[PDB]
Amino acid sequence: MKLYKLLILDIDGTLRDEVYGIPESAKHAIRLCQKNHCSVVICTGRSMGTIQDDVLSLGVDGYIAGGGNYIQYHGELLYNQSFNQRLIKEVVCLLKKREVAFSIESQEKVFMNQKAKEIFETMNQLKTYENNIEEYKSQDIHKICLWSNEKVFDEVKDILQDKMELAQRDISSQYYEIIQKDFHKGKAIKRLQERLGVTQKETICFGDGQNDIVMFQASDVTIAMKNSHQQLKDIATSICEDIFDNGIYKELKRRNII
Amino acid sequence: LYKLLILDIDGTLRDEVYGIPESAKHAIRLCQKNHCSVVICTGRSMGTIQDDVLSLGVDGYIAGGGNYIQYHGELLYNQSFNQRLIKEVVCLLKKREVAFSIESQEKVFMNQKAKEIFETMNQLKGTNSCINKQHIQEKITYENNIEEYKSQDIHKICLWSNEKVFDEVKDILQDKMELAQRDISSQYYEIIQKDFHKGKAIKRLQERLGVTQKETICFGDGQNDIVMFQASDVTIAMKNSHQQLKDIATSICEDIFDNGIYKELKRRNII
Numbered sequence A: 001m002k003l004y005k006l007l008i009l010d011i012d013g014t015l016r017d018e019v020y021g022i023p024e025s026a027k028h029a030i031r032l033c034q035k036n037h038c039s040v041v042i043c044t045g046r047s048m049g050t051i052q053d054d055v056l057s058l059g060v061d062g063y064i065a066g067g068g069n070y071i072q073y074h075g076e077l078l079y080n081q082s083f084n085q086r087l088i089k090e091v092v093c094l095l096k097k098r099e100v101a102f103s104i105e106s107q108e109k110v111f112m113n114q115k116a117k118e119i120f121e122t123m124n125q126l127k128t129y130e131n132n133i134e135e136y137k138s139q140d141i142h143k144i145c146l147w148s149n150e151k152v153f154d155e156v157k158d159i160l161q162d163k164m165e166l167a168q169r170d171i172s173s174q175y176y177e178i179i180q181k182d183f184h185k186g187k188a189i190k191r192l193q194e195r196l197g198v199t200q201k202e203t204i205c206f207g208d209g210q211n212d213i214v215m216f217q218a219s220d221v222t223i224a225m226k227n228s229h230q231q232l233k234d235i236a237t238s239i240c241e242d243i244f245d246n247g248i249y250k251e252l253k254r255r256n257i258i
Numbered sequence B: 001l002y003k004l005l006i007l008d009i010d011g012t013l014r015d016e017v018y019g020i021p022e023s024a025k026h027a028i029r030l031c032q033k034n035h036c037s038v039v040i041c042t043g044r045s046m047g048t049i050q051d052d053v054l055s056l057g058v059d060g061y062i063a064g065g066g067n068y069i070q071y072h073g074e075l076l077y078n079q080s081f082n083q084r085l086i087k088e089v090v091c092l093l094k095k096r097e098v099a100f101s102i103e104s105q106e107k108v109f110m111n112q113k114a115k116e117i118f119e120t121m122n123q124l125k126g127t128n129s130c131i132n133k134q135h136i137q138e139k140i141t142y143e144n145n146i147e148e149y150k151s152q153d154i155h156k157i158c159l160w161s162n163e164k165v166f167d168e169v170k171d172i173l174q175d176k177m178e179l180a181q182r183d184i185s186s187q188y189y190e191i192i193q194k195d196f197h198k199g200k201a202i203k204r205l206q207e208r209l210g211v212t213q214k215e216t217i218c219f220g221d222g223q224n225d226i227v228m229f230q231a232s233d234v235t236i237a238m239k240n241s242h243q244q245l246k247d248i249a250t251s252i253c254e255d256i257f258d259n260g261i262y263k264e265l266k267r268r269n270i271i
């Protein structure tokens, strides 16, 4: 028997196409889920400060943000974890000395160096950013994005040690997405479930990236798309259609959730 | 033997015009050398705390008037208002056309009337300020940026209005709020979260550090420090402090640049 109480949705490439935004069918699906007593919670690597306006306009029940460091539900901030400030200063000091592209994030802003800005500029050309790393001083930081060799990464691991884990890793581009140990999307989903009195069996998620693989152990059903990260597709319960082929709506309709 | 020195910023540790005296900096180093932790306890957010305070190398920071607690870099507490309630309040105050500001831990969001209140407070820097010194910041330029508020986590609402407009804010927030401070003559209300005032914050840290009220000494100045005094054994004010704080204070120490903090600590054999 299945009666879902929690829909977990990733934003980028799941709920929302990076170029064409959110399809009406997904907005409708969300509205229908909520009518059927199934909470809809955004579960994103984005911070509340970088979540897009169209996502904020949906009236979802909660937000798991920063890749799992921040949990808000029905407006109430439940969890908001940030790295030890002294450890961030050491990392920032190291990474400036190493002259590698990097960024750090608070729940409001992304602080990035020149090399990192140049990476995001080029990412956008393959569809403004500022060298503002010197604006970091006392903000609460929950994520470090690093483009470097294995040696520079090991130096960051020597500073953070057991306090960190990788949310995501792209070997080819030398990219590491560093978050706090046990504050990935999966752990946040569990914390939220525990606050709401919802079980794993009552939870269904939709993801697309490597940062969504962790959603699986927190969910009964995990849905990916054809274009999703292969490791996610390999463990997904099913593959729904692409964003603008009404994948979320159709998947929810097939499972009789809406 | 005291284990926790709680220091206020504005009007106690730091003079609004002249900054922090060397005796205070030296007294902090001396307390730490004697295994007494030094923790800043301010209405300021980590984002509005002045660089000279950040350069001191204090053991921790109780910020936002008590919603935020950090110790040895470790963020221990960081409470923010319900986002939906803040939307209602922001919506209500825009239509009532009163000066107001809301604060996140990084930033202050203020309407036009509030920008003008703050510009004037900076122009009046050096005069007997009381509350103005708690808001003055040379770091930023003030501006009508309330429309930039959307999803930021908010812990404080500053309101300049009649009690009708305040009663309307109280109807929305109910027992989720309390007044950290209030200046009746200027119609000022400093609205914080219920049970996240300076004393409750001091008590959370005491609990975590395993330090007692008896092992805690505080230095305060404003109406917002009355509660600070209630979570401490020895409470120190100054001659120009808020009278209600002076009424409950253990002692009155000398003015900032008369080395009050150092002299009081030396007199008590803490340093």
Ligand code: NA
Pocket (backbone or CB within 6 Å): A010, A011, A012, A013, A014, A207, A208, A209
């Ligand atoms: Na994604």
